[PDB]
PDB file of N, CA and C in Angstrom:
ATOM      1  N   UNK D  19      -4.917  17.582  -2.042  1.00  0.00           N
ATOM      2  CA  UNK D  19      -6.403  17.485  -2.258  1.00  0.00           C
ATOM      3  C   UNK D  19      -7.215  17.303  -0.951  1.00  0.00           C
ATOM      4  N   UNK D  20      -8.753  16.945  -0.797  1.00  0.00           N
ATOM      5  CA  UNK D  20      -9.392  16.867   0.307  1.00  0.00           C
ATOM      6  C   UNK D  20      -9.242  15.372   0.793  1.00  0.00           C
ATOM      7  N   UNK D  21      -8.615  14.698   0.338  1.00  0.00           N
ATOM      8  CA  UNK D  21      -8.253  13.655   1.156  1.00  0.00           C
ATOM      9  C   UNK D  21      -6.834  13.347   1.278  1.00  0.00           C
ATOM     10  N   UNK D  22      -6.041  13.412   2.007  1.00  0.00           N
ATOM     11  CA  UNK D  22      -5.286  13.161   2.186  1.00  0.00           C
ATOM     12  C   UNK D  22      -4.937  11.683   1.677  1.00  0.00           C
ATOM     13  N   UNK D  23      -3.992  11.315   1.429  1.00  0.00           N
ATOM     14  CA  UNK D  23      -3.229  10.535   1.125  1.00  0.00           C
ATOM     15  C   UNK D  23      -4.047   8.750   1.190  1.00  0.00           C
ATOM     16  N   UNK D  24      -3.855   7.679   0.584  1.00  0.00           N
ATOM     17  CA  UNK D  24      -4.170   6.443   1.470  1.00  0.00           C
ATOM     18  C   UNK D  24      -2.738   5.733   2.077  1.00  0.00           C
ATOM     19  N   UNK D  25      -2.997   5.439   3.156  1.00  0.00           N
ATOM     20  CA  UNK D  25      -1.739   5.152   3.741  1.00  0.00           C
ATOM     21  C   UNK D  25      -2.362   3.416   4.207  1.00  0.00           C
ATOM     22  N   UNK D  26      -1.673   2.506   4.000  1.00  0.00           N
ATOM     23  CA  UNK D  26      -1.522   1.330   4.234  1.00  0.00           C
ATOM     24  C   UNK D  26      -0.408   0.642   4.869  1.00  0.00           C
ATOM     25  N   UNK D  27      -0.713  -0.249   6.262  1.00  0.00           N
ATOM     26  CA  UNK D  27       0.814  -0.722   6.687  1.00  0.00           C
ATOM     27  C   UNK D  27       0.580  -1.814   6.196  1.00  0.00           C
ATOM     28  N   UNK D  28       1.710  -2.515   5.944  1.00  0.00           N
ATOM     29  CA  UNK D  28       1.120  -3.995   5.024  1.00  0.00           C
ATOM     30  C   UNK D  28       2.598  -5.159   5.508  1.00  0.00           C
ATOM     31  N   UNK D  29       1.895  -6.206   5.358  1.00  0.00           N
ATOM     32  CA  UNK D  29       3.286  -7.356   5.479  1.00  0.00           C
ATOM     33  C   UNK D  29       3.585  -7.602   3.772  1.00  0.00           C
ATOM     34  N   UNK D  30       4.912  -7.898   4.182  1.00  0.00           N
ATOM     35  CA  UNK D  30       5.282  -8.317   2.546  1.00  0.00           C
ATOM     36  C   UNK D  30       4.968 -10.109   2.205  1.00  0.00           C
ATOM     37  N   UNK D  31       4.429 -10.422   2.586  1.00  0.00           N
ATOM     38  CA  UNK D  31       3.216 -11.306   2.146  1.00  0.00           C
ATOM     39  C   UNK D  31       1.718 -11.004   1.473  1.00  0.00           C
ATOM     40  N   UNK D  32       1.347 -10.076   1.937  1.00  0.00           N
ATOM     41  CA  UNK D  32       0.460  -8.838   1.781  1.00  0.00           C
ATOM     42  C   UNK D  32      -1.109  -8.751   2.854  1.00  0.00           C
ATOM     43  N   UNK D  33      -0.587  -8.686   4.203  1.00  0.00           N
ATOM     44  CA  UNK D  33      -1.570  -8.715   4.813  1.00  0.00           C
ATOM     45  C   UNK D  33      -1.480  -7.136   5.478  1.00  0.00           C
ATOM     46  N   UNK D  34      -3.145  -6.494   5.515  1.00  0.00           N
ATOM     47  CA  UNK D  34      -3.184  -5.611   5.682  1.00  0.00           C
ATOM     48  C   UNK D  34      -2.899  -5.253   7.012  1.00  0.00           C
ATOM     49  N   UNK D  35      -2.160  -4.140   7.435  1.00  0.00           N
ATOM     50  CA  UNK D  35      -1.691  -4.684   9.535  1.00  0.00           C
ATOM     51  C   UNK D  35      -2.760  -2.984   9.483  1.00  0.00           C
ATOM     52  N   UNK D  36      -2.703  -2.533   8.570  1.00  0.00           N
ATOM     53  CA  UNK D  36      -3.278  -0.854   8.972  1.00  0.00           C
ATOM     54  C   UNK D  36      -4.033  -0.390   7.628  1.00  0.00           C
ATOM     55  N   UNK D  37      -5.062   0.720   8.122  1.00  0.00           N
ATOM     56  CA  UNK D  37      -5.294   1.003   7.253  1.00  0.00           C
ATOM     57  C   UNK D  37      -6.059   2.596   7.633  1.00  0.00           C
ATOM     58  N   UNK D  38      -5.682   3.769   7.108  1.00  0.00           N
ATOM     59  CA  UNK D  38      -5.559   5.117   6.788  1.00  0.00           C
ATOM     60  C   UNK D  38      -7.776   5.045   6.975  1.00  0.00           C
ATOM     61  N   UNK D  39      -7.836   6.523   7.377  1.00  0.00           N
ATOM     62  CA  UNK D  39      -9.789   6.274   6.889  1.00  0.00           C
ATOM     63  C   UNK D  39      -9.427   6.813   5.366  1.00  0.00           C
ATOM     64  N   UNK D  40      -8.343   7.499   5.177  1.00  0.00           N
ATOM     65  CA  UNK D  40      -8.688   7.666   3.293  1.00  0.00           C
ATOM     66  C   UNK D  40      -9.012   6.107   2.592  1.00  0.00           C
ATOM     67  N   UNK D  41      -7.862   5.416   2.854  1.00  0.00           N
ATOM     68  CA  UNK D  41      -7.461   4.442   2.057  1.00  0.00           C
ATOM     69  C   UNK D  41      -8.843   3.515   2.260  1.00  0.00           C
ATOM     70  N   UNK D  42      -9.519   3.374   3.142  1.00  0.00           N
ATOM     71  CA  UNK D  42     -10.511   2.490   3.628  1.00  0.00           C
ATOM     72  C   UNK D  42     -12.045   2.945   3.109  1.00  0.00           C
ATOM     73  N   UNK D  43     -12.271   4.111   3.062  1.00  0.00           N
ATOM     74  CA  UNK D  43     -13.545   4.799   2.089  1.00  0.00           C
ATOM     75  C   UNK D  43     -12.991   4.643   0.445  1.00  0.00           C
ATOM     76  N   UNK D  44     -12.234   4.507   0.097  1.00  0.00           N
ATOM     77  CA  UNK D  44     -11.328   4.542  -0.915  1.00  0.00           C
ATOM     78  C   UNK D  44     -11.934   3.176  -1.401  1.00  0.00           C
ATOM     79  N   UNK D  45     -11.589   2.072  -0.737  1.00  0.00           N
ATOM     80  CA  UNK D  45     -11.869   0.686  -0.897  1.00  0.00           C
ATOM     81  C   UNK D  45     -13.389   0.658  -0.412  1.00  0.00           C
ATOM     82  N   UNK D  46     -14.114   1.357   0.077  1.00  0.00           N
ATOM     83  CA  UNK D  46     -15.480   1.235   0.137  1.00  0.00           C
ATOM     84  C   UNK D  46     -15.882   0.135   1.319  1.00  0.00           C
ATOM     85  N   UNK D  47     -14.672   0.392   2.342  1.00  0.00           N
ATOM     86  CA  UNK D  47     -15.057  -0.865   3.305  1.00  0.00           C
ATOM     87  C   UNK D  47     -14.681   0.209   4.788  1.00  0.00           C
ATOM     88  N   UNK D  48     -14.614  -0.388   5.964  1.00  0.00           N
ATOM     89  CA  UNK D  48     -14.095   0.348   7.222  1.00  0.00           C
ATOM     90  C   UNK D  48     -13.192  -0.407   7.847  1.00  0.00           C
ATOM     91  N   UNK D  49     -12.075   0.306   8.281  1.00  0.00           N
ATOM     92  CA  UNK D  49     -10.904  -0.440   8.759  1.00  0.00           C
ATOM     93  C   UNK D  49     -11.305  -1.863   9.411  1.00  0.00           C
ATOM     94  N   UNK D  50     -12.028  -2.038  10.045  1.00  0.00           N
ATOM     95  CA  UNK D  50     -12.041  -3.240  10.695  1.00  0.00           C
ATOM     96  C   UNK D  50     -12.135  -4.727  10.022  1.00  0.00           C
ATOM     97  N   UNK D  51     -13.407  -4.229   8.515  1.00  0.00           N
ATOM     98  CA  UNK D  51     -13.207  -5.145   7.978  1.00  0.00           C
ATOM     99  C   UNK D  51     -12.094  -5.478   7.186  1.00  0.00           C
ATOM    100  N   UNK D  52     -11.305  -4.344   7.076  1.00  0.00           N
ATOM    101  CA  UNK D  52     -10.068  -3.952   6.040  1.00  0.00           C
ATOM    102  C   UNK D  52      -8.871  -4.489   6.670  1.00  0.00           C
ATOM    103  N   UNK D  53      -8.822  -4.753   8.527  1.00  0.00           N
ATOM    104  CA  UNK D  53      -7.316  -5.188   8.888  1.00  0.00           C
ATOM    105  C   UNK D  53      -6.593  -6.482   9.430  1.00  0.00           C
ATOM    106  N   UNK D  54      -7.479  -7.889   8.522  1.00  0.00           N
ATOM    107  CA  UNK D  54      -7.311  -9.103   8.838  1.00  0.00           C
ATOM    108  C   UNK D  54      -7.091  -8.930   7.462  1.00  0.00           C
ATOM    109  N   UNK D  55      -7.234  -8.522   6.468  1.00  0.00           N
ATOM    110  CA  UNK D  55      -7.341  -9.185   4.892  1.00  0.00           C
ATOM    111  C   UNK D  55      -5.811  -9.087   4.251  1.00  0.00           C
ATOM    112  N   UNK D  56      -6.117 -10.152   3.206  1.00  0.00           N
ATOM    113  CA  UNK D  56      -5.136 -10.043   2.628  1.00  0.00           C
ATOM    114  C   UNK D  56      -5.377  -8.979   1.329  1.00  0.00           C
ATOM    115  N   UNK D  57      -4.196  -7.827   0.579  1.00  0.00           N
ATOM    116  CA  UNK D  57      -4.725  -6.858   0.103  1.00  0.00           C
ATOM    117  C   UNK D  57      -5.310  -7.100  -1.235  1.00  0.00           C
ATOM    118  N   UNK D  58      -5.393  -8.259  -1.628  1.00  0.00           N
ATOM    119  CA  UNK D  58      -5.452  -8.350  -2.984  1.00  0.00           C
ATOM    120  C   UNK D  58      -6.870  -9.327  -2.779  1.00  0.00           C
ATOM    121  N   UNK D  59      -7.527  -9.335  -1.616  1.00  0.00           N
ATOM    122  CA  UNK D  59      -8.877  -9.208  -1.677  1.00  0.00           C
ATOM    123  C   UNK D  59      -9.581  -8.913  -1.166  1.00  0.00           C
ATOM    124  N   UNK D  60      -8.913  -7.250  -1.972  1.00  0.00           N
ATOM    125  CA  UNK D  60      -9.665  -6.254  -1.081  1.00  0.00           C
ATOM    126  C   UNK D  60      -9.721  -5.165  -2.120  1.00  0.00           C
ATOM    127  N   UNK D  61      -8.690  -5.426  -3.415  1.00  0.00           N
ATOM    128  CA  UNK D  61      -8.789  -3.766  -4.157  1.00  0.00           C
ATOM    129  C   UNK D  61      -8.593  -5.772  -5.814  1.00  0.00           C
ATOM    130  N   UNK D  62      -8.504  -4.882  -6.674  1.00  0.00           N
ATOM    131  CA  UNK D  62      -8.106  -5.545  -7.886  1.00  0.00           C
ATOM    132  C   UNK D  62      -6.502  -6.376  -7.921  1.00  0.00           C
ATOM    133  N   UNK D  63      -6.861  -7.437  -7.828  1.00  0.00           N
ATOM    134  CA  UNK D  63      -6.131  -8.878  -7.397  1.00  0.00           C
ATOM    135  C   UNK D  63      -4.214  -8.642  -7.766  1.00  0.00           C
ATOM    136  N   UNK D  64      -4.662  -8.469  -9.407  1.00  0.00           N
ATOM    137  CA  UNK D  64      -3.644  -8.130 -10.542  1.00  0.00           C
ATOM    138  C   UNK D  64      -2.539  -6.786  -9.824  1.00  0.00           C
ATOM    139  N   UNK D  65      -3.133  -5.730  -9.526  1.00  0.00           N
ATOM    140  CA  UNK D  65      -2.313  -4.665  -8.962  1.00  0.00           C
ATOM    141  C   UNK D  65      -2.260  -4.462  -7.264  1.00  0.00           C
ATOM    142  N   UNK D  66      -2.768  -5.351  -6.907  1.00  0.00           N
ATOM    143  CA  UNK D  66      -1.972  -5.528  -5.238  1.00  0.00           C
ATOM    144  C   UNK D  66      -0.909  -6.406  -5.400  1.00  0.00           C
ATOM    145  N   UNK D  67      -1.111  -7.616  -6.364  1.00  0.00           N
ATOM    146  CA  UNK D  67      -0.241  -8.111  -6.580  1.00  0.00           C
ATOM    147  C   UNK D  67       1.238  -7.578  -6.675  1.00  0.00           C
ATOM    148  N   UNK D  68       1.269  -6.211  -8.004  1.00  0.00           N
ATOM    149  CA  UNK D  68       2.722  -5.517  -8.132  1.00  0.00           C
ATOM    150  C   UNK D  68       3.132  -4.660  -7.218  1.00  0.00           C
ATOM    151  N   UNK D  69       1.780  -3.963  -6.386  1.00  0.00           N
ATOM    152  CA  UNK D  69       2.270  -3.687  -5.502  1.00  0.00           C
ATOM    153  C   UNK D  69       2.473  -4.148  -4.536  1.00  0.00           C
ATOM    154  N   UNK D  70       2.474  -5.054  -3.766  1.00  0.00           N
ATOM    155  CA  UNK D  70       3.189  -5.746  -3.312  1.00  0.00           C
ATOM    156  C   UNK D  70       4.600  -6.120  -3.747  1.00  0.00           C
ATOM    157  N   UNK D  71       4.814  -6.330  -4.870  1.00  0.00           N
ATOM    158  CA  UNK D  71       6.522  -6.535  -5.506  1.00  0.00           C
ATOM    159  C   UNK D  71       7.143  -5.507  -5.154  1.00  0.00           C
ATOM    160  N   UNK D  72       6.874  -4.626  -5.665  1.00  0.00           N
ATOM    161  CA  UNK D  72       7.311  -3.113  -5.254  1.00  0.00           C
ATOM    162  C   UNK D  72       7.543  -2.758  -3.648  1.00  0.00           C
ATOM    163  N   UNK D  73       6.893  -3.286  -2.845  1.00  0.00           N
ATOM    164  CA  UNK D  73       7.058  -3.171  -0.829  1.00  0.00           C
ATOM    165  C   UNK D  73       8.615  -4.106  -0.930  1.00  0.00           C
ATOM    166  N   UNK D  74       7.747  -5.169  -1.603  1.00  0.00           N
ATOM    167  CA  UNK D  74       8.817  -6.428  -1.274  1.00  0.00           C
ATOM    168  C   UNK D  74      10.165  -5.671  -1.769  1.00  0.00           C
ATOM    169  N   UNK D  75      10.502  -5.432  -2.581  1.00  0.00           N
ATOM    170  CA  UNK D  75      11.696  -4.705  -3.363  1.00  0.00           C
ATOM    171  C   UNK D  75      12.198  -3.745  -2.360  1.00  0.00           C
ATOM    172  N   UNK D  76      11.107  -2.557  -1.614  1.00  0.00           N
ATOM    173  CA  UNK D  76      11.561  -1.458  -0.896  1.00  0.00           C
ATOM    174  C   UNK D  76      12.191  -2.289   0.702  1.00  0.00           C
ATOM    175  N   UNK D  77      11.569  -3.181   1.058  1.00  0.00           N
ATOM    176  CA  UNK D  77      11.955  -3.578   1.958  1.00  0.00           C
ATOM    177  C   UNK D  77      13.340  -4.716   1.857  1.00  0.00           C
ATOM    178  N   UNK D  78      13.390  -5.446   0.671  1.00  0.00           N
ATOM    179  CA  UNK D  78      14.768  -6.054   0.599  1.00  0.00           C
ATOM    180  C   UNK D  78      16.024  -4.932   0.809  1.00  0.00           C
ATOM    181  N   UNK D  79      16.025  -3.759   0.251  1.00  0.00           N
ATOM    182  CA  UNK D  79      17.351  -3.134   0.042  1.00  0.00           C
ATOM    183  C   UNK D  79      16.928  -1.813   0.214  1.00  0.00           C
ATOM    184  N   UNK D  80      16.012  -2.042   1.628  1.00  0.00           N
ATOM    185  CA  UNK D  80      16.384  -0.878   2.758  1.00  0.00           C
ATOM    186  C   UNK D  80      15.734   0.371   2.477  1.00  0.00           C
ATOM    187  N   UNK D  81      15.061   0.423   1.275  1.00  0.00           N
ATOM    188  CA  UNK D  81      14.854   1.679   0.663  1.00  0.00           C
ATOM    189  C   UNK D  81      13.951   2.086   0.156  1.00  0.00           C
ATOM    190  N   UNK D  82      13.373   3.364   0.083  1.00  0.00           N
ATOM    191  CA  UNK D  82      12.155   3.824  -0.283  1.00  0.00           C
ATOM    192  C   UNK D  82      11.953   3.758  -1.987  1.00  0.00           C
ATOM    193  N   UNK D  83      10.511   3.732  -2.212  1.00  0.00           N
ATOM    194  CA  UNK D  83      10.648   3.081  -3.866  1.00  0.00           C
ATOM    195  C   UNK D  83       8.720   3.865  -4.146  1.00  0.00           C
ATOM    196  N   UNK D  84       8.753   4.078  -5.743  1.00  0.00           N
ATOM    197  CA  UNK D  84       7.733   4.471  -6.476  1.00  0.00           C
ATOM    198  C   UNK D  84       7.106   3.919  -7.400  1.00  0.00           C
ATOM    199  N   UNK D  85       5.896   4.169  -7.632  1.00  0.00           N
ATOM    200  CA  UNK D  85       5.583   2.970  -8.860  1.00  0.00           C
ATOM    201  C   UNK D  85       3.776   3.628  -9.056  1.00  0.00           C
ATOM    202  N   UNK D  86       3.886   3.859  -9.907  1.00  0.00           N
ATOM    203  CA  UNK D  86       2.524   4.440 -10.561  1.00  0.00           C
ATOM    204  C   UNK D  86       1.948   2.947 -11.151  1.00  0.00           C
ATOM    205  N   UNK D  87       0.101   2.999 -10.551  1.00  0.00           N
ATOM    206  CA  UNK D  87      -0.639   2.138 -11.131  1.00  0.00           C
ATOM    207  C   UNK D  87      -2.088   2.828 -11.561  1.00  0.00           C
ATOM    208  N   UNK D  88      -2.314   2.105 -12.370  1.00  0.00           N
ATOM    209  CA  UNK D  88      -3.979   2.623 -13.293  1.00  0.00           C
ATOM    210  C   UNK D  88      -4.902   1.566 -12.299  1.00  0.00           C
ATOM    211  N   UNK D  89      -5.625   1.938 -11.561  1.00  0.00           N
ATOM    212  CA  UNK D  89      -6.850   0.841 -11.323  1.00  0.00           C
ATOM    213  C   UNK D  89      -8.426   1.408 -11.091  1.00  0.00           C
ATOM    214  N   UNK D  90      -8.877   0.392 -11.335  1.00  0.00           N
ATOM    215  CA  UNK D  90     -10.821   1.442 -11.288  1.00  0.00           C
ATOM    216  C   UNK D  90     -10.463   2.399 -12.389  1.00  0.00           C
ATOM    217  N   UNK D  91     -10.946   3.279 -12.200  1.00  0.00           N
ATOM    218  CA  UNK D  91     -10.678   4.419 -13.449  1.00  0.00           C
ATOM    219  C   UNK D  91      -9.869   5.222 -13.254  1.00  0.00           C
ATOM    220  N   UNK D  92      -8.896   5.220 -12.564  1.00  0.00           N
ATOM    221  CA  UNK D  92      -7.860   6.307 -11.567  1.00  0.00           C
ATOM    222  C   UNK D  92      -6.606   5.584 -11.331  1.00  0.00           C
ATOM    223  N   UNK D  93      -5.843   6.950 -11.329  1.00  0.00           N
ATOM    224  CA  UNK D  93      -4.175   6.454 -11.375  1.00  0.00           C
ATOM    225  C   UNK D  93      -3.957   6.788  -9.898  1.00  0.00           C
ATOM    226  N   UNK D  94      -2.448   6.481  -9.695  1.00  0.00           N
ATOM    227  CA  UNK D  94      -2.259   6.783  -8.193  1.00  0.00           C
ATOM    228  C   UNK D  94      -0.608   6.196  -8.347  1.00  0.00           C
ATOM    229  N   UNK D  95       0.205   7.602  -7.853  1.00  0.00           N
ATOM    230  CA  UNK D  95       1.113   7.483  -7.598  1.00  0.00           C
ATOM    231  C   UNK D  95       1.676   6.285  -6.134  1.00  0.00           C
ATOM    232  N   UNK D  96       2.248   5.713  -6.010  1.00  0.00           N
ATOM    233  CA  UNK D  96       2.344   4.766  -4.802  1.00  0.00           C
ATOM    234  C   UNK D  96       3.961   5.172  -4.488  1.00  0.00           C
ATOM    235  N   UNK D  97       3.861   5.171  -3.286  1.00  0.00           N
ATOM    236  CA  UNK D  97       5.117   4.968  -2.451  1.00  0.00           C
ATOM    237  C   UNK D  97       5.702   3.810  -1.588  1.00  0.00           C
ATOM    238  N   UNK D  98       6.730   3.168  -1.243  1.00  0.00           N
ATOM    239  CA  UNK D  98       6.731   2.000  -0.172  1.00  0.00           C
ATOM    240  C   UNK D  98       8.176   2.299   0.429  1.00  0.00           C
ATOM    241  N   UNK D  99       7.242   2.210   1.886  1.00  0.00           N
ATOM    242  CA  UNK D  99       8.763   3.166   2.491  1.00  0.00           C
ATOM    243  C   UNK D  99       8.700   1.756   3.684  1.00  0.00           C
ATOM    244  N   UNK D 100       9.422   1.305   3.490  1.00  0.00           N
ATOM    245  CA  UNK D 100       9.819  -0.106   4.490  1.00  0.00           C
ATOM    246  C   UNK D 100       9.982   0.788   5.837  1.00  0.00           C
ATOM    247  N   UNK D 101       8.980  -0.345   7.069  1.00  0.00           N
ATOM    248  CA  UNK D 101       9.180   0.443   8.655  1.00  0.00           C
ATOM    249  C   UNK D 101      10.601  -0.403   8.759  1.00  0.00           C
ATOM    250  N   UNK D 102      11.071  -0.339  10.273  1.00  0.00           N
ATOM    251  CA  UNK D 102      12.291  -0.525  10.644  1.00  0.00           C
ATOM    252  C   UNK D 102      13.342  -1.262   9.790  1.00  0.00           C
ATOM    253  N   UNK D 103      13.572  -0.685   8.814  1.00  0.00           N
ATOM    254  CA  UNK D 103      14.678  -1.381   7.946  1.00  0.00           C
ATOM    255  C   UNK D 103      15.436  -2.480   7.759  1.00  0.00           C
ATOM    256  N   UNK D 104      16.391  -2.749   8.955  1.00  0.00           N
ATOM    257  CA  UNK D 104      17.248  -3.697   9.412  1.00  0.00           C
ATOM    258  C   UNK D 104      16.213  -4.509  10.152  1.00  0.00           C
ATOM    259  N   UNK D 105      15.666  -4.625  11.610  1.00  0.00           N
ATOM    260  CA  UNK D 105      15.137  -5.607  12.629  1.00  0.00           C
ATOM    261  C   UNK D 105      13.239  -5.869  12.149  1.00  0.00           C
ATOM    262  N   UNK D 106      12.833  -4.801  11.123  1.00  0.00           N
ATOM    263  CA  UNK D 106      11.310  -5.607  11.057  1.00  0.00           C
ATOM    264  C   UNK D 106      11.004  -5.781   9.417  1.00  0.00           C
ATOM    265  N   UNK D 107      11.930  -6.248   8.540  1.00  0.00           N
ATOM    266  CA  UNK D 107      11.882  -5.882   7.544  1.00  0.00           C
ATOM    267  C   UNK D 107      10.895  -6.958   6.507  1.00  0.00           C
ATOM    268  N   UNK D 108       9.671  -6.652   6.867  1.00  0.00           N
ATOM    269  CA  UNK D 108       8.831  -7.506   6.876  1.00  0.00           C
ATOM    270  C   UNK D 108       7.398  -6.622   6.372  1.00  0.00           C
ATOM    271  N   UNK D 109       7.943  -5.650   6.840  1.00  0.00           N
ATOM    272  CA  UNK D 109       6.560  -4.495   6.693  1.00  0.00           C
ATOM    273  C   UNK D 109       6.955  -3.045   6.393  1.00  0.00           C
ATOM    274  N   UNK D 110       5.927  -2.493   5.646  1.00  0.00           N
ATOM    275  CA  UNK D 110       5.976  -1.560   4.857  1.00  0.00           C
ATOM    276  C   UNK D 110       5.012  -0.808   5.154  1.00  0.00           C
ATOM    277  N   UNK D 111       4.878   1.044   4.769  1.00  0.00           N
ATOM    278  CA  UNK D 111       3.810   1.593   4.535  1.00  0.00           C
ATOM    279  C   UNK D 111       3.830   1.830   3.183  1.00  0.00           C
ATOM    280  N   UNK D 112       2.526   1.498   2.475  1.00  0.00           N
ATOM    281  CA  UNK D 112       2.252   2.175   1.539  1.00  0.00           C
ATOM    282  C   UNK D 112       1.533   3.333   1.557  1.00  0.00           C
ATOM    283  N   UNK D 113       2.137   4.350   0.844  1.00  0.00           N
ATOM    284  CA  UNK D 113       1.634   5.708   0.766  1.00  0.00           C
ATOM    285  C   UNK D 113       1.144   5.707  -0.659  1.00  0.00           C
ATOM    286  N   UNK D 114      -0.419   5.824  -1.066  1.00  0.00           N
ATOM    287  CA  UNK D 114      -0.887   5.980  -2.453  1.00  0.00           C
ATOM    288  C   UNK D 114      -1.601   7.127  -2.505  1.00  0.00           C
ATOM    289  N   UNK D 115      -1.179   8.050  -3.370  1.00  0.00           N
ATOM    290  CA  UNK D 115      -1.452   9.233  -4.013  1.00  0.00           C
ATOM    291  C   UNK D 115      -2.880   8.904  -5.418  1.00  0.00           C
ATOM    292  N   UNK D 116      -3.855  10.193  -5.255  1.00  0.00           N
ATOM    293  CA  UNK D 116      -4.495   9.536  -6.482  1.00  0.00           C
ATOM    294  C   UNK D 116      -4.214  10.849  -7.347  1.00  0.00           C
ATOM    295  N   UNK D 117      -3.883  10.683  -8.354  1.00  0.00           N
ATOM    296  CA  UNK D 117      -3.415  11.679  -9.633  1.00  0.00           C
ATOM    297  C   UNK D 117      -4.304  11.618 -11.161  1.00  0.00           C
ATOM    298  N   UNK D 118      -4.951  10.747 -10.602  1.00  0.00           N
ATOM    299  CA  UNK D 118      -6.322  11.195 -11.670  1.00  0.00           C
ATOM    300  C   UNK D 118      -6.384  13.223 -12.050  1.00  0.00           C
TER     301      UNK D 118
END
């Protein structure tokens, strides 16, 4: 589609370390205010929450992971592909697709 992807780097605590210009017009804010926050107050509390479980999960056991959520009026496929696996396994990108 015309926007590419929202891409989020995130701690598995859930602090935002990055943030995509999709993902950030998306949330209706601009990276800057977007890369001290924590993510769940920043989009709907309830589903940063699981996603976050879902990073946390990809990053325990090394591995890339999927998980479709409904939020606002729009779905969005999500991805969480843990960065350095073994030595930073602490952080994740989320890759969210919208499939509305």
């Amino acid at each position: 589609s015309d926007s590419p992807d929202g891409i989020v780097h995130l701690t598995t605590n859930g602090t935002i370390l990055s943030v995509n210009p999709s993902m950030a017009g998306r949330l209706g804010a601009d990276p800057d205010t977007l890369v001290g926050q924590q993510l769940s107050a920043v989009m709907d509390s309830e589903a940063a929450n699981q996603r976050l479980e879902a990073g946390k999960s990809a990053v325990e056991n090394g591995t890339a992971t999927r998980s479709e959520d409904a939020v606002g009026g729009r779905h969005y496929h999500n991805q969480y592909i843990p960065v350095d696996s073994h030595r930073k396994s602490d952080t994740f990108q989320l890759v969210s697709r919208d499939i509305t």
